[PDB]
Amino acid sequence: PVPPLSVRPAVVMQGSARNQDDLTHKLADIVKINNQLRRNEQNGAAAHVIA
Amino acid sequence: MNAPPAFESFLLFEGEKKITINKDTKVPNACLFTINKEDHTLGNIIKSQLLKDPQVLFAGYKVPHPLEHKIIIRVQTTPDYSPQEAFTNAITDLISELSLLEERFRVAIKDKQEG
């Protein structure tokens, strides 16, 4: 589950753009690697790299 | 930021009566005067002039609180002498004292200079 924007609000900085809560980074690190794990199993099905 | 104005002690704004007279139901012939914007200078003179009057059973003042400026003077007199009469004769007797003191202090000055 991915908790809603309320539970992980952004940070609006008038100086430059926005900052993001810890979860939004911690959830980005999951979606990156989950996707790398999507391709390997779908493309090469290489067994030792998945581990 | 909450400090009250300095002038707020001796100046009356709109609607404040100087004196407020309220009868006292505990006692016959008892009255209670309320003087706004005064302090122990004025209250103590009168109390001590009321206790010379042999028809005055009780007289006293208090400042209810020091940060608000008003005096509360209870007076109880003997029957057939009104506590408003007691408090007026007090004020006219000081004026007849202090007018005698200001004249006797002027004589002692002229005597004092070159005499």
């Binding site: 609000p9 | 930021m1 122990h40 103590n44």
Partner: protein
Amino acid sequence: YNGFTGRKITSQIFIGPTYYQRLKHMVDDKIHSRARGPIQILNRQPMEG
């Protein structure tokens, strides 16, 4: 002598010059009052400080 009534004070009082310090702590900087003001972003509760 009493200041209000003029009369002496029965017990004798101990007076002398003494050296006092005024402290960084004043009431104007410690005073605070709150009614329906700013509100925290995440908790929707009142701000701190």
